[model samples]
Target: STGSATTTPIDSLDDAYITPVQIGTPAQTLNLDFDTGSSDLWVFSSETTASEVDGQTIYTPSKSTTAKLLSGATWSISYGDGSSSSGDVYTDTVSVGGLTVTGQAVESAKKVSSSFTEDSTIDGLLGLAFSTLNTVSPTQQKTFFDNAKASLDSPVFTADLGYHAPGTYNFGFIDTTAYTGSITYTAVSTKQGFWEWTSTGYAVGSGTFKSTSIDGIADTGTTLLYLPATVVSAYWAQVSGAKSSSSVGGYVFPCSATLPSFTFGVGSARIVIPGDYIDFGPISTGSSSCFGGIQSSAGIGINIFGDVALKAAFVVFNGATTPTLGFASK
Candidate 1:
């Protein structure tokens, strides 16, 4: 709904392609995915023409009228999960929701992987997490938000990610009524831009962990939360008739038993994980089920609060202030 201006249609690329997000107020269209794993704002251009790239969205300069290419600058992006994309650097004028911004940083696609070329609707990614996570140099920090912040009615940006459904990524002026008042805020650590946490430990089928306190981070982009295997086995041992099953190379569980309620404390705020998440899926290949949410970590890192955790809370990533992730009351 771009006023009476005939809303631009974002067609579906494939079921797996990225969605386009209009940047700046008045919304200049930039196809992007709301990524939480890392915080970096990026877009693809039309200049790229690679056959091997498949599955991800690639932006072309010709597609945007306000696009301007940056000469002599090279740019490339890689993900920790092994996905990667690269292109020549460019500066483009962009607008979103009626607010306009000039000299926006963009990536002109030249050489991209098969994963990026395959996208049908999405053009790039909009990372709203932290500055340290930003790939740009410290001198060039706040590339997207710095430009869009003024046009935003409020200092806040809310992500309305649909539950297992195609959702809209909204920016600025969060409707307070949309969230719970019990906001749990996590401060960004100086070491990196990642969110910091303090775990009170596990408590199954009940409230509060009676065990050890665990430290971890919460991410919305990750699909599942990763926890220590030893801690996981101990927790599941209590779930009656819980068994394991395979879900996309990861372990899942299913059961009718009650699951422990867990919480992580961050700056006087408590974030809770409901048992519904743990009680919904299989545990592993043909094994008994525990719950849907809990699974083997394979020891990647501290526990990740994925969509399972995000669905339970209204999240706001505010860059206007310090790099702080605030959770609206659930």
Candidate 2:
């Protein structure tokens, strides 16, 4: 049987996609964010201070008969958005859909940022990026995919992310039914432990395509698309009343703005991001101000094709000998 899991969007916020995962022998289920930006399977746990956990579910290692402590092992990670988490490690059986891996490193979070603590729905994060990015100290940890790949029918996974709807993450096999049209394949540079690829160029609306090559990452954990300030400015210039608001910390525009489509190139194929998707939603409902789904990468150094961009296309993350990325319209 093929391995697969269903991913659902968080209600209201729609900031990230989450899937159910089973940890330990008897199986303590947790809702985890499948993050392509980081490589650590850290979760809220009994080790976390009660005050910091808020309403999130906690995984108790001691309650699991199969759980074992990875002595002296620990992990700490910080995101581009500044959210952070740190914890000790435990080895346990982890299962997602029909796939299961024994002795997978499970980081039990003892400390988490206010951002994570406040998000009661996200129990933890499942790192889907390369194992090289694993944060466990004393010894590097392997992700659930890494440990399960050797036995998988194929060393690949497909991320079918949707906007405010349910999607599916398939392991070891690609479901042609999930996507339409031919998948455009691009070689990925995993040196940075990211699904890093270079875009040939981009265009605002139906404007002429530029020839600048942009290096960026496909990060499912991030909520919005980010690009160089110059590139972001070019797209926002077409919108009347759009401006970089320090108060909003991003480009914001009037709710009535007639936004144009944004297009990016993967080789000769151009993937267009709808104008409606760019209007992320009001900064607050009924607040005339709305934040642009696309923003300036600025100090972040590299661009990120986050949920805003990923949801526009179907993505296949091939983890075989030479990692590659395949994109198609959903």
Q: Best candidate, lDDT-wise?
A: 2
lDDT of 2 at 71: 99
Using TM-score as the measure, the top candidate is 2
Clashing pairs in 2: none
lDDT by residue for model 2 (1-330), tens: 358999999974468888999999799999999998888999999999788988888899999999999999999999888999998999999999889999999999999999999999999999989999999998999988888888888898888887778889889898988878889989899999999999889999989999899999999989899999999999999999999999889999999887899998888877888888787768977899988999999979899999888888889889889998988887
TM-score of each: 0.72, 0.97
- How many pairs collide in each candidate, listed in order? 65, 0
Q: Provide C-alpha RMSD values for all models, in order.
A: 5.6, 1.3
lDDT of 2: 0.90
lDDT of 1 by residue, 193-289 (tens): 5554545455554544455655555565555556777666666666565444454444444445667654544455655666654443443445454
